[PDB]
Amino acid sequence: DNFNYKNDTKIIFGKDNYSEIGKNIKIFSKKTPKILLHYEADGELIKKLGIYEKVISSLKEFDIEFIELGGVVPNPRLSLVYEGIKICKEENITFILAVGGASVIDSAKAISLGAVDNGDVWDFFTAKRIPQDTLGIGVVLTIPGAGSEMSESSIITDENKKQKAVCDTEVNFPKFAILNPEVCYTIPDRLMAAGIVDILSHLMERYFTKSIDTALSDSLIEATMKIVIKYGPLLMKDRKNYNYCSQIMWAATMAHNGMIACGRVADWASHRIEHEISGIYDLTHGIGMAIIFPAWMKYTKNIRPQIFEKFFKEVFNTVNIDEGINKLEEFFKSLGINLKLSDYGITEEYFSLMAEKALGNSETLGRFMQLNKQDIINILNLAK
């Protein structure tokens, strides 16, 4: 149970600090800076929220020239990376400012790769060549989900082949990421609640593990989880509260940190099951992770019951798995979330279809518990 850890992304955390955009562009861009401002669509949100302008007022404040590129799709297209690469070689862009969420942060990362490369950028997603440099990006995050602002991955889709892929390498690490919890305020309720689940789930998938000798790390993952459990409901009912937003945003960041999860095997079973509820139904990840995970832990409560007893003792102050599973259920409902799939008029109709697609060509699925097709149907019946 050894492990390595790197993460060089600079964290600029806090509020009323919009100068550090400029400052940090100067610090990690060569020569004189000239940047690309990247965002989903035509600035429609970042502008409506007032980030756009205060962004611009930072660049002006620092004599930073800049072209803009827009038109990002929620799952972004190499269509537009080929666009942005042309522009960074054409206009000698020396640095890119991702303003938005993970799917512009993703597109930004892939432009930063090709801006510096001689060949085609797919070869870096194709598993053909391993990029050895990028220009470098700074992110201004508007929504604390998934942590692409601090990761080494980029998730793009080739729509004319519509084969999607990813590229995972230490070059993709942002040079810096601005994190202001104020951006949490304008987020809609059901989307805020699902992002609080994503954080807890990210933590639980690493926590529930067959690994041993993990006490310290157990403690840290417990601490973050417990904070998500305490504050998530408060933020839900006090959306503009900077403190509440700071604990939550900071929790999501730490959840994405391999210092606290350090040499322990993550189980992705709940993720994959949910992936296929979301493939056939219009349903938000986080909401599906609140209906499935309790189903899954109910079905896996016999593998290492001790590590379940521990979980619920540390986090819900109780040694009975049943009582604690229900407290976790109750905590999900305290963020607006109905706990069953029937409640979303999802029926048993495609449980079979979903279970086959989840397993694909494998026979089982999972690490904590190896789960086969009928196992998965049982879990879906538990969550019905």
Q: Tokens for 170?
A: 């230490």
* Strand 163-168 relative to strand 153-158, pairing: antiparallel
Q: Give the up-direction half-sphere exposure of residue 83: CA atoms within 13 A in the CB hemisphere.
A: 15
Shortest Å distance, C-beta 84 to ligand ADP: 18
Backbone discontinuities in the chain, residue before each (C to N > 2.5 A)? none
Q: Which of 228, 143, 148 is nearest to 183 (CA)?
A: 143
What does the alpha-carbon distance between residue 373 and residue 363 come to, in Å, rounded to a whole number? Answer: 8
Residue 210 makes contact with a second copy by CB under 8 A: no
Residues paired with 36 in a beta bridge: 67, 96
Between vectors from CA 351 to CA 308 and to CA 205, what angle results, nearest 5°?
A: 30
What does 271 bind: ligand ADP, a second copy, Fe ion, none (CB cut-off 5 to 8 Å by kind)?
Fe ion
- Interface positions, 297-336, toward a second copy (CB under 8 A): none
Is the separation of the CB atoms in 207 and 311 below 8 Å? yes
Binding site for Fe ion (CB under 5 A): 271
What does 247 bind: Fe ion, a second copy, ligand ADP, none (CB cut-off 5 to 8 Å by kind)?
a second copy
Instruction: Tell me which residue has tokens 């989880």.
Output: 225
Instruction: Tell me which residue has tokens 């990210």.
Output: 202
What does 145 bind: Fe ion, a second copy, ligand ADP, none (CB cut-off 5 to 8 Å by kind)?
ligand ADP
Q: Tokens for 287?
A: 């909401």
Shortest Å distance, C-beta 49 to ligand ADP: 6
From 1, 91, 189, 348, residue interacting with a second copy (rule: CB under 8 A): 1
- Interface positions, 80-99, toward a second copy (CB under 8 A): none
Shortest Å distance, C-beta 222 to ligand ADP: 25
Is the separation of the CB atoms in 297 and 316 below 8 Å? no
Shortest Å distance, C-beta 154 to a second copy: 20
Binding site for ligand ADP (CB under 6 A): 45, 74, 100-103, 142-143, 145-146, 183, 186-187, 191
Binding site for a second copy (CB under 8 A): 1-8, 10-15, 17, 213, 215-217, 219-220, 222-224, 226-227, 230-231, 242-243, 246-247, 250-251, 254, 257, 259-260, 262-263
For the annotated binding site, the residues are 102-103, 142, 148, 151, 183, 205
